[PDB]
Design a protein around this ligand. Structure first.
Ligand SMILES: Clc1ccc(C2(c3ccc(-c4cn[nH]c4)cc3)CCNCC2)cc1
Lengths: 317, 10
């Protein structure tokens, strides 16, 4: 059994709409974890029960190097708690904000790790749906780690479909902005939005008013820097093809289509999953408690039912 | 700089 007092509570890594994430140390071992802490009544009152449990179930049934691993999930009479492996290098967002743009090669690297991750997830019949720079963390070695699995849909193989309107306004795919249903190819639209950002240094489409944002997604053609490569242009246009069926990764091959694109010609897809390639950047952290890749905004601050049936967890590893 | 984004579900 796992309680709150198995942990020392070092500092805040970040906040979301229903909780917060803290770096903690397992009292009995000296090991470090990012722990996500949410309040039951808030989740109850905002009908966020389904998502919270899916997040658990999906973390309980997925094992991949470029996905955040769950060590413990427990609850107390008033809270839900995910003890996740700690990603020492913060968000890809932090790094892209700081640097403005990545080289194609560095973008290719993180691209391939995301494609390996999505391929896996698709093979486990789950669609992620919320690819964005904020959800792509870096581990201590500099490998992608996908986080936040609450909007996943499970039980989606081959060409099955989903109905719910969800995601992140700026990264929603055209088909999600039309009525009714959509397939797993939305994740290739998401990939496409982060590859664009990573290589072009902005979002492909943006407006602060959602009505104008959605207009652009459905109806504006993307633009490229003149000095983006023929093959980077080609990837981006493919991944950001508005019709999911014409989209690179939208056929029945799914990930295969993307992996086979000339932008990734230098990638050995087996080397990718086994982490045999030197990453283009290593988080230069001095200690286990060093949070230099999380915004000071968050790191500066202080430390204060059959419904939840499939939530609890202990990892064999 | 790009502002932080927020996930939703309807
Ligand atoms: Cl309640 C909540 C939800 C999501 C987070 C975020 C988060 C922070 C840290 C970690 C983390 C996992 N392992 N190491 C850090 C994951 C997700 C999500 C990604 N954007 C930044 C905040 C914090 C709090």
């Amino acid at each position: 059994k796992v309680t709150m007092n198995d942990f020392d509570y070092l500092k805040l890594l970040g906040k979301g709409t229903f909780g917060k994430v803290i770096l903690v140390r397992e009292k009995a071992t000296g090991r470090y974890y990012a722990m996500k802490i949410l309040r039951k009544e808030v989740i109850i009152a905002k009908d966020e029960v389904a998502h919270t449990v899916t997040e658990s179930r999906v973390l309980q049934n997925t094992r991949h190097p470029f996905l955040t691993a769950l060590k413990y999930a427990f609850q107390t009479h008033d809270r839900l708690c995910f003890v996740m492996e700690y990603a020492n290098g913060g968000e890809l967002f932090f790094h892209l904000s700081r640097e403005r743009v990545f080289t194609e090669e560095r973008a290719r690297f993180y691209g391939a790790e995301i494609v390996s991750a999505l391929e896996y997830l698709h093979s486990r019949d789950v669609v992620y749906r919320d690819i964005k720079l904020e959800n792509l963390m870096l581990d201590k070695d500099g490998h992608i780690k996908i986080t936040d699995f609450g909007l996943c849909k499970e039980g989606i193989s081959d060409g099955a479909t989903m109905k719910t309107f969800c995601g992140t306004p700026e990264y929603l795919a055209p088909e999600v902005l039309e009525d009714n249903d959509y397939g797993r190819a939305v994740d290739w639209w998401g990939l496409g939005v982060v590859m664009y950002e990573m290589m072009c240094g902005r979002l492909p489409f943006y407006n602060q008013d959602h009505e104008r944002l959605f207009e652009l997604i459905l109806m504006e053609e993307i633009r490229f820097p003149r000095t983006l490569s023929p093959e980077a242009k080609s990837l981006l246009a493919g991944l950001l093809k508005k019709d999911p069926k014409q989209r690179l990764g939208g056929g029945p091959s799914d990930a295969k289509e993307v992996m086979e694109h000339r932008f990734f010609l230098s990638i050995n897809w087996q080397d990718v999953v086994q982490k045999k390639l030197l990453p283009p950047f290593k988080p230069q952290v001095t200690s286990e408690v060093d949070t230099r890749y999380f915004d000071d905004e968050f790191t500066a601050q202080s430390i204060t039912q059959e419904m939840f049936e499939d939530f609890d967890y202990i990892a064999d590893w | 700089g790009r502002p932080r984004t927020t996930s939703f579900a309807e």
